[PDB]
RNA sequence: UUAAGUUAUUAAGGGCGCACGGUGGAUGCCUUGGCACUAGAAGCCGAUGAAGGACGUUACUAACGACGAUAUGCUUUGGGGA
């Protein structure tokens, strides 16, 4: 998942960020209830958010020059 | 049976020796770190916010490292081949 991101509009980038955060908050918020058995899934999510914001920032630069 | 004479047996415990352990950690051997130096480079960092630090970040997480709310790491460019 590196150039799935490059296929975006610079506006869809925001929405998948938000929805990924709600996905996450669902998991974090279940997590102390113990409903969750999945452990390593969260890393994938948080890393995705890192990617989306990274690329958004890079294009933020190259839309500045 | 008598008088006289002599004399050892005892080891509660101790000493000498001999053995078997226990204690505690020297010596022997080794190095996971260091001392002193040669050749060569480099000899600065910072208001475009340092050096140094606080608080946090892991699936469960107390500490060191690593990192900083994009958080136990992100993208790219090369290298490498489970």
């Amino acid at each position: 998942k590196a150039k799935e991101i490059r296929d975006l509009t610079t506006s869809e980038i925001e929405e998948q960020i938000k929805s990924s955060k709600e996905e996450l908050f669902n998991l974090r918020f279940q997590l102390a209830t113990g409903q969750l058995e999945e452990t390593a899934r969260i890393r994938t999510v948080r890393k995705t958010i890192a990617r989306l914001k990274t690329v958004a920032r890079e294009r933020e630069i190259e839309q500045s020059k």
Short mmCIF file of all heavy atoms in Angstrom, two decimals, chain B residues 22-42:
data_model
loop_
_atom_site.label_atom_id
_atom_site.label_comp_id
_atom_site.label_asym_id
_atom_site.label_seq_id
_atom_site.Cartn_x
_atom_site.Cartn_y
_atom_site.Cartn_z
P G B 22 30.53 -29.66 51.29
OP1 G B 22 29.40 -29.73 50.32
OP2 G B 22 31.91 -29.44 50.79
"O5'" G B 22 30.17 -28.51 52.31
"C5'" G B 22 29.06 -28.67 53.17
"C4'" G B 22 28.98 -27.56 54.18
"O4'" G B 22 29.87 -27.82 55.27
"C3'" G B 22 29.36 -26.18 53.68
"O3'" G B 22 28.29 -25.55 53.01
"C2'" G B 22 29.76 -25.47 54.96
"O2'" G B 22 28.61 -24.95 55.58
"C1'" G B 22 30.32 -26.61 55.81
N9 G B 22 31.78 -26.63 55.86
C8 G B 22 32.60 -27.46 55.15
N7 G B 22 33.86 -27.28 55.42
C5 G B 22 33.86 -26.26 56.34
C6 G B 22 34.93 -25.67 57.02
O6 G B 22 36.13 -25.89 56.88
N1 G B 22 34.49 -24.68 57.88
C2 G B 22 33.18 -24.35 58.10
N2 G B 22 32.94 -23.39 58.99
N3 G B 22 32.16 -24.92 57.49
C4 G B 22 32.58 -25.86 56.64
P U B 23 28.53 -24.26 52.09
OP1 U B 23 27.20 -23.66 51.85
OP2 U B 23 29.39 -24.59 50.94
"O5'" U B 23 29.29 -23.25 53.05
"C5'" U B 23 28.55 -22.39 53.89
"C4'" U B 23 29.44 -21.58 54.79
"O4'" U B 23 30.49 -22.40 55.33
"C3'" U B 23 30.18 -20.46 54.10
"O3'" U B 23 29.36 -19.32 53.98
"C2'" U B 23 31.40 -20.24 54.97
"O2'" U B 23 31.12 -19.30 55.99
"C1'" U B 23 31.61 -21.61 55.61
N1 U B 23 32.84 -22.31 55.18
C2 U B 23 34.01 -21.95 55.77
O2 U B 23 34.09 -21.04 56.58
N3 U B 23 35.11 -22.66 55.37
C4 U B 23 35.15 -23.68 54.46
O4 U B 23 36.22 -24.23 54.21
C5 U B 23 33.89 -24.02 53.91
C6 U B 23 32.81 -23.35 54.29
P G B 24 28.70 -18.90 52.58
OP1 G B 24 27.40 -18.28 52.90
OP2 G B 24 28.78 -20.01 51.61
"O5'" G B 24 29.62 -17.71 52.10
"C5'" G B 24 29.93 -16.68 53.00
"C4'" G B 24 31.43 -16.48 53.14
"O4'" G B 24 32.08 -17.71 53.50
"C3'" G B 24 32.12 -16.02 51.88
"O3'" G B 24 32.05 -14.61 51.79
"C2'" G B 24 33.54 -16.56 52.03
"O2'" G B 24 34.35 -15.66 52.75
"C1'" G B 24 33.34 -17.80 52.88
N9 G B 24 33.34 -19.07 52.16
C8 G B 24 32.21 -19.53 51.57
N7 G B 24 32.32 -20.70 51.04
C5 G B 24 33.62 -21.05 51.33
C6 G B 24 34.27 -22.25 51.01
O6 G B 24 33.86 -23.21 50.36
N1 G B 24 35.58 -22.22 51.45
C2 G B 24 36.15 -21.21 52.15
N2 G B 24 37.41 -21.46 52.47
N3 G B 24 35.54 -20.08 52.48
C4 G B 24 34.27 -20.07 52.04
P G B 25 32.22 -13.87 50.40
OP1 G B 25 31.71 -12.49 50.51
OP2 G B 25 31.70 -14.74 49.32
"O5'" G B 25 33.80 -13.81 50.27
"C5'" G B 25 34.38 -13.52 49.03
"C4'" G B 25 35.61 -14.34 48.80
"O4'" G B 25 35.31 -15.73 49.10
"C3'" G B 25 36.10 -14.30 47.35
"O3'" G B 25 37.49 -14.03 47.24
"C2'" G B 25 35.77 -15.67 46.81
"O2'" G B 25 36.68 -16.14 45.84
"C1'" G B 25 35.78 -16.54 48.06
N9 G B 25 34.95 -17.73 47.91
C8 G B 25 33.68 -17.78 47.41
N7 G B 25 33.18 -18.96 47.30
C5 G B 25 34.19 -19.76 47.77
C6 G B 25 34.22 -21.14 47.88
O6 G B 25 33.34 -21.96 47.62
N1 G B 25 35.43 -21.57 48.36
C2 G B 25 36.47 -20.79 48.72
N2 G B 25 37.50 -21.47 49.20
N3 G B 25 36.48 -19.47 48.62
C4 G B 25 35.30 -19.03 48.13
P A B 26 37.97 -13.26 45.92
OP1 A B 26 37.94 -11.80 46.18
OP2 A B 26 37.19 -13.82 44.80
"O5'" A B 26 39.48 -13.69 45.73
"C5'" A B 26 40.50 -12.92 46.31
"C4'" A B 26 41.66 -13.79 46.68
"O4'" A B 26 41.16 -14.99 47.28
"C3'" A B 26 42.47 -14.27 45.50
"O3'" A B 26 43.43 -13.32 45.07
"C2'" A B 26 43.07 -15.57 46.00
"O2'" A B 26 44.24 -15.32 46.76
"C1'" A B 26 41.98 -16.08 46.94
N9 A B 26 41.14 -17.16 46.39
C8 A B 26 39.89 -17.07 45.87
N7 A B 26 39.37 -18.23 45.53
C5 A B 26 40.35 -19.13 45.88
C6 A B 26 40.44 -20.53 45.78
N6 A B 26 39.49 -21.33 45.29
N1 A B 26 41.58 -21.11 46.21
C2 A B 26 42.54 -20.34 46.70
N3 A B 26 42.57 -19.03 46.86
C4 A B 26 41.44 -18.49 46.42
P U B 27 43.67 -13.09 43.50
OP1 U B 27 44.71 -12.05 43.36
OP2 U B 27 42.36 -12.93 42.82
"O5'" U B 27 44.36 -14.44 43.04
"C5'" U B 27 45.54 -14.85 43.69
"C4'" U B 27 45.89 -16.28 43.41
"O4'" U B 27 44.92 -17.16 44.03
"C3'" U B 27 45.88 -16.70 41.96
"O3'" U B 27 47.08 -16.34 41.30
"C2'" U B 27 45.65 -18.20 42.04
"O2'" U B 27 46.85 -18.89 42.32
"C1'" U B 27 44.75 -18.32 43.25
N1 U B 27 43.32 -18.46 42.92
C2 U B 27 42.67 -19.62 43.25
O2 U B 27 43.17 -20.59 43.80
N3 U B 27 41.36 -19.64 42.91
C4 U B 27 40.64 -18.66 42.29
O4 U B 27 39.45 -18.84 42.05
C5 U B 27 41.37 -17.49 41.99
C6 U B 27 42.66 -17.44 42.31
P G B 28 47.06 -15.90 39.76
OP1 G B 28 48.47 -15.70 39.35
OP2 G B 28 46.06 -14.83 39.56
"O5'" G B 28 46.53 -17.19 39.02
"C5'" G B 28 47.31 -18.37 39.05
"C4'" G B 28 46.67 -19.48 38.28
"O4'" G B 28 45.47 -19.94 38.92
"C3'" G B 28 46.22 -19.13 36.89
"O3'" G B 28 47.30 -19.10 35.97
"C2'" G B 28 45.21 -20.21 36.59
"O2'" G B 28 45.85 -21.40 36.21
"C1'" G B 28 44.57 -20.42 37.96
N9 G B 28 43.28 -19.75 38.14
C8 G B 28 43.13 -18.66 38.93
N7 G B 28 41.92 -18.24 39.02
C5 G B 28 41.21 -19.13 38.25
C6 G B 28 39.85 -19.13 37.98
O6 G B 28 39.02 -18.34 38.42
N1 G B 28 39.49 -20.19 37.16
C2 G B 28 40.35 -21.11 36.64
N2 G B 28 39.76 -22.04 35.88
N3 G B 28 41.65 -21.10 36.89
C4 G B 28 42.02 -20.08 37.70
P C B 29 47.35 -17.98 34.83
OP1 C B 29 48.60 -18.21 34.07
OP2 C B 29 47.11 -16.64 35.42
"O5'" C B 29 46.09 -18.34 33.92
"C5'" C B 29 45.98 -19.64 33.38
"C4'" C B 29 44.66 -19.90 32.72
"O4'" C B 29 43.61 -20.11 33.70
"C3'" C B 29 44.11 -18.79 31.86
"O3'" C B 29 44.75 -18.70 30.60
"C2'" C B 29 42.64 -19.15 31.77
"O2'" C B 29 42.46 -20.20 30.84
"C1'" C B 29 42.37 -19.68 33.17
N1 C B 29 41.79 -18.64 34.05
C2 C B 29 40.46 -18.25 33.94
O2 C B 29 39.72 -18.75 33.10
N3 C B 29 39.98 -17.30 34.76
C4 C B 29 40.76 -16.74 35.67
N4 C B 29 40.26 -15.80 36.46
C5 C B 29 42.10 -17.11 35.80
C6 C B 29 42.57 -18.05 34.98
P C B 30 44.87 -17.28 29.88
OP1 C B 30 45.46 -17.49 28.54
OP2 C B 30 45.53 -16.34 30.81
"O5'" C B 30 43.35 -16.86 29.66
"C5'" C B 30 42.56 -17.65 28.79
"C4'" C B 30 41.10 -17.26 28.72
"O4'" C B 30 40.43 -17.38 30.00
"C3'" C B 30 40.78 -15.85 28.31
"O3'" C B 30 41.00 -15.60 26.94
"C2'" C B 30 39.32 -15.74 28.71
"O2'" C B 30 38.52 -16.47 27.80
"C1'" C B 30 39.32 -16.50 30.02
N1 C B 30 39.39 -15.61 31.20
C2 C B 30 38.30 -14.83 31.61
O2 C B 30 37.23 -14.81 31.00
N3 C B 30 38.43 -14.05 32.71
C4 C B 30 39.58 -14.07 33.37
N4 C B 30 39.71 -13.32 34.44
C5 C B 30 40.68 -14.85 32.98
C6 C B 30 40.53 -15.60 31.91
P U B 31 41.16 -14.09 26.42
OP1 U B 31 41.29 -14.14 24.95
OP2 U B 31 42.22 -13.44 27.22
"O5'" U B 31 39.77 -13.41 26.78
"C5'" U B 31 38.59 -13.79 26.08
"C4'" U B 31 37.37 -13.01 26.48
"O4'" U B 31 37.27 -12.90 27.93
"C3'" U B 31 37.31 -11.59 25.93
"O3'" U B 31 36.02 -11.28 25.42
"C2'" U B 31 37.58 -10.73 27.16
"O2'" U B 31 36.99 -9.45 27.10
"C1'" U B 31 36.97 -11.57 28.26
N1 U B 31 37.54 -11.26 29.58
C2 U B 31 36.87 -10.41 30.43
O2 U B 31 35.79 -9.89 30.20
N3 U B 31 37.51 -10.18 31.61
C4 U B 31 38.72 -10.70 32.00
O4 U B 31 39.18 -10.40 33.09
C5 U B 31 39.35 -11.54 31.05
C6 U B 31 38.74 -11.78 29.90
P U B 32 35.88 -10.22 24.22
OP1 U B 32 35.47 -10.95 23.00
OP2 U B 32 37.09 -9.36 24.23
"O5'" U B 32 34.67 -9.29 24.67
"C5'" U B 32 33.52 -9.86 25.28
"C4'" U B 32 32.46 -8.82 25.56
"O4'" U B 32 31.53 -9.39 26.51
"C3'" U B 32 32.97 -7.52 26.17
"O3'" U B 32 32.17 -6.42 25.74
"C2'" U B 32 32.79 -7.76 27.66
"O2'" U B 32 32.60 -6.59 28.42
"C1'" U B 32 31.55 -8.65 27.71
N1 U B 32 31.60 -9.61 28.81
C2 U B 32 30.98 -9.31 30.00
O2 U B 32 30.36 -8.28 30.20
N3 U B 32 31.11 -10.28 30.96
C4 U B 32 31.79 -11.48 30.85
O4 U B 32 31.82 -12.26 31.80
C5 U B 32 32.41 -11.71 29.59
C6 U B 32 32.29 -10.78 28.64
P G B 33 32.80 -5.28 24.79
OP1 G B 33 31.67 -4.57 24.15
OP2 G B 33 33.86 -5.87 23.94
"O5'" G B 33 33.48 -4.26 25.80
"C5'" G B 33 32.68 -3.36 26.54
"C4'" G B 33 33.41 -2.80 27.73
"O4'" G B 33 34.34 -3.78 28.24
"C3'" G B 33 34.26 -1.58 27.49
"O3'" G B 33 33.50 -0.39 27.44
"C2'" G B 33 35.22 -1.62 28.65
"O2'" G B 33 34.61 -1.09 29.80
"C1'" G B 33 35.44 -3.12 28.83
N9 G B 33 36.67 -3.60 28.18
C8 G B 33 36.71 -4.14 26.94
N7 G B 33 37.91 -4.50 26.58
C5 G B 33 38.70 -4.18 27.66
C6 G B 33 40.10 -4.31 27.83
O6 G B 33 40.92 -4.80 27.05
N1 G B 33 40.52 -3.87 29.06
C2 G B 33 39.70 -3.32 30.00
N2 G B 33 40.31 -2.94 31.12
N3 G B 33 38.40 -3.16 29.86
C4 G B 33 37.96 -3.60 28.66
P G B 34 34.19 0.99 27.00
OP1 G B 34 33.23 2.10 27.22
OP2 G B 34 34.78 0.80 25.66
"O5'" G B 34 35.37 1.19 28.05
"C5'" G B 34 36.54 1.90 27.69
"C4'" G B 34 37.65 1.65 28.67
"O4'" G B 34 38.01 0.25 28.68
"C3'" G B 34 38.96 2.35 28.36
"O3'" G B 34 38.96 3.72 28.72
"C2'" G B 34 39.95 1.51 29.13
"O2'" G B 34 39.88 1.80 30.51
"C1'" G B 34 39.39 0.11 28.91
N9 G B 34 40.01 -0.59 27.77
C8 G B 34 39.41 -1.07 26.64
N7 G B 34 40.23 -1.65 25.82
C5 G B 34 41.45 -1.55 26.45
C6 G B 34 42.73 -1.99 26.06
O6 G B 34 43.07 -2.60 25.05
N1 G B 34 43.69 -1.68 27.01
C2 G B 34 43.45 -1.03 28.18
N2 G B 34 44.50 -0.82 28.96
N3 G B 34 42.27 -0.61 28.56
C4 G B 34 41.33 -0.91 27.66
P C B 35 39.80 4.77 27.84
OP1 C B 35 39.51 6.13 28.36
OP2 C B 35 39.63 4.47 26.40
"O5'" C B 35 41.30 4.46 28.24
"C5'" C B 35 41.68 4.51 29.60
"C4'" C B 35 43.16 4.32 29.79
"O4'" C B 35 43.52 2.93 29.63
"C3'" C B 35 44.05 5.06 28.81
"O3'" C B 35 44.24 6.41 29.17
"C2'" C B 35 45.33 4.24 28.87
"O2'" C B 35 46.02 4.55 30.06
"C1'" C B 35 44.77 2.83 28.99
N1 C B 35 44.57 2.17 27.68
C2 C B 35 45.59 1.52 26.97
O2 C B 35 46.75 1.48 27.40
N3 C B 35 45.28 0.95 25.78
C4 C B 35 44.05 0.99 25.32
N4 C B 35 43.75 0.43 24.17
C5 C B 35 43.02 1.62 26.02
C6 C B 35 43.31 2.19 27.17
P A B 36 44.51 7.54 28.05
OP1 A B 36 44.81 8.79 28.76
OP2 A B 36 43.44 7.52 27.02
"O5'" A B 36 45.87 7.08 27.38
"C5'" A B 36 47.05 7.08 28.15
"C4'" A B 36 48.22 6.51 27.39
"O4'" A B 36 47.98 5.13 27.07
"C3'" A B 36 48.52 7.17 26.06
"O3'" A B 36 49.32 8.32 26.23
"C2'" A B 36 49.19 6.08 25.26
"O2'" A B 36 50.58 6.06 25.52
"C1'" A B 36 48.55 4.81 25.82
N9 A B 36 47.49 4.25 24.98
C8 A B 36 46.16 4.35 25.23
N7 A B 36 45.40 3.76 24.36
C5 A B 36 46.31 3.23 23.48
C6 A B 36 46.13 2.48 22.32
N6 A B 36 44.95 2.14 21.87
N1 A B 36 47.21 2.08 21.63
C2 A B 36 48.40 2.43 22.11
N3 A B 36 48.70 3.14 23.19
C4 A B 36 47.60 3.51 23.84
P C B 37 49.50 9.37 25.04
OP1 C B 37 50.49 10.39 25.46
OP2 C B 37 48.15 9.79 24.59
"O5'" C B 37 50.14 8.52 23.87
"C5'" C B 37 49.62 8.61 22.56
"C4'" C B 37 50.27 7.64 21.62
"O4'" C B 37 49.70 6.32 21.81
"C3'" C B 37 50.06 7.94 20.15
"O3'" C B 37 50.98 8.89 19.66
"C2'" C B 37 50.19 6.57 19.51
"O2'" C B 37 51.55 6.21 19.34
"C1'" C B 37 49.57 5.67 20.57
N1 C B 37 48.13 5.40 20.33
C2 C B 37 47.73 4.66 19.23
O2 C B 37 48.57 4.28 18.41
N3 C B 37 46.42 4.42 19.04
C4 C B 37 45.54 4.85 19.92
N4 C B 37 44.26 4.59 19.72
C5 C B 37 45.91 5.58 21.06
C6 C B 37 47.20 5.82 21.23
P U B 38 50.64 9.80 18.39
OP1 U B 38 51.72 10.81 18.28
OP2 U B 38 49.24 10.28 18.47
"O5'" U B 38 50.80 8.81 17.16
"C5'" U B 38 52.07 8.27 16.82
"C4'" U B 38 52.06 7.55 15.50
"O4'" U B 38 51.40 6.26 15.62
"C3'" U B 38 51.32 8.23 14.36
"O3'" U B 38 52.10 9.24 13.73
"C2'" U B 38 50.99 7.07 13.45
"O2'" U B 38 52.14 6.67 12.73
"C1'" U B 38 50.65 5.99 14.46
N1 U B 38 49.22 5.98 14.83
C2 U B 38 48.27 5.41 14.01
O2 U B 38 48.55 4.95 12.92
N3 U B 38 46.99 5.47 14.51
C4 U B 38 46.58 5.98 15.72
O4 U B 38 45.41 5.97 16.08
C5 U B 38 47.62 6.52 16.49
C6 U B 38 48.86 6.49 16.04
P A B 39 51.40 10.42 12.89
OP1 A B 39 52.48 11.24 12.30
OP2 A B 39 50.36 11.07 13.72
"O5'" A B 39 50.67 9.66 11.70
"C5'" A B 39 51.43 9.10 10.64
"C4'" A B 39 50.54 8.56 9.55
"O4'" A B 39 49.75 7.45 10.06
"C3'" A B 39 49.51 9.52 9.01
"O3'" A B 39 50.05 10.40 8.05
"C2'" A B 39 48.45 8.59 8.45
"O2'" A B 39 48.86 8.09 7.18
"C1'" A B 39 48.49 7.44 9.44
N9 A B 39 47.47 7.53 10.50
C8 A B 39 47.77 7.87 11.78
N7 A B 39 46.78 7.85 12.62
C5 A B 39 45.74 7.45 11.83
C6 A B 39 44.40 7.24 12.15
N6 A B 39 43.97 7.42 13.38
N1 A B 39 43.55 6.85 11.20
C2 A B 39 44.06 6.68 9.97
N3 A B 39 45.31 6.84 9.53
C4 A B 39 46.12 7.23 10.53
P G B 40 49.42 11.86 7.84
OP1 G B 40 50.04 12.39 6.60
OP2 G B 40 49.57 12.63 9.10
"O5'" G B 40 47.87 11.58 7.57
"C5'" G B 40 47.45 11.00 6.35
"C4'" G B 40 45.95 10.84 6.25
"O4'" G B 40 45.48 9.81 7.15
"C3'" G B 40 45.11 12.04 6.61
"O3'" G B 40 45.10 13.04 5.61
"C2'" G B 40 43.75 11.40 6.84
"O2'" G B 40 43.08 11.14 5.62
"C1'" G B 40 44.14 10.08 7.50
N9 G B 40 44.00 10.14 8.96
C8 G B 40 45.01 10.34 9.84
N7 G B 40 44.60 10.35 11.08
C5 G B 40 43.24 10.15 10.99
C6 G B 40 42.26 10.06 12.00
O6 G B 40 42.41 10.15 13.22
N1 G B 40 41.00 9.84 11.47
C2 G B 40 40.72 9.72 10.14
N2 G B 40 39.44 9.52 9.83
N3 G B 40 41.63 9.81 9.19
C4 G B 40 42.86 10.01 9.68
P A B 41 44.63 14.53 5.96
OP1 A B 41 44.69 15.33 4.71
OP2 A B 41 45.35 15.00 7.17
"O5'" A B 41 43.08 14.38 6.30
"C5'" A B 41 42.16 14.17 5.24
"C4'" A B 41 40.78 13.85 5.73
"O4'" A B 41 40.82 12.83 6.74
"C3'" A B 41 40.01 14.98 6.38
"O3'" A B 41 39.43 15.86 5.43
"C2'" A B 41 38.98 14.25 7.23
"O2'" A B 41 37.87 13.86 6.44
"C1'" A B 41 39.75 12.99 7.63
N9 A B 41 40.26 13.01 9.01
C8 A B 41 41.57 13.08 9.39
N7 A B 41 41.77 13.02 10.68
C5 A B 41 40.49 12.90 11.17
C6 A B 41 40.02 12.78 12.46
N6 A B 41 40.85 12.78 13.50
N1 A B 41 38.70 12.67 12.65
C2 A B 41 37.91 12.66 11.58
N3 A B 41 38.23 12.75 10.30
C4 A B 41 39.55 12.87 10.16
P A B 42 39.22 17.42 5.76
OP1 A B 42 38.44 18.02 4.65
OP2 A B 42 40.53 18.00 6.14
"O5'" A B 42 38.30 17.42 7.05
"C5'" A B 42 36.94 17.03 6.96
"C4'" A B 42 36.29 17.07 8.32
"O4'" A B 42 36.78 15.97 9.13
"C3'" A B 42 36.57 18.30 9.15
"O3'" A B 42 35.79 19.42 8.79
"C2'" A B 42 36.32 17.79 10.56
"O2'" A B 42 34.94 17.68 10.81
"C1'" A B 42 36.91 16.39 10.47
N9 A B 42 38.35 16.38 10.80
C8 A B 42 39.36 16.64 9.93
N7 A B 42 40.56 16.58 10.43
C5 A B 42 40.30 16.25 11.74
C6 A B 42 41.16 16.04 12.79
N6 A B 42 42.47 16.13 12.65
N1 A B 42 40.66 15.73 13.98
C2 A B 42 39.32 15.65 14.10
N3 A B 42 38.39 15.82 13.17
C4 A B 42 38.96 16.13 12.00
#
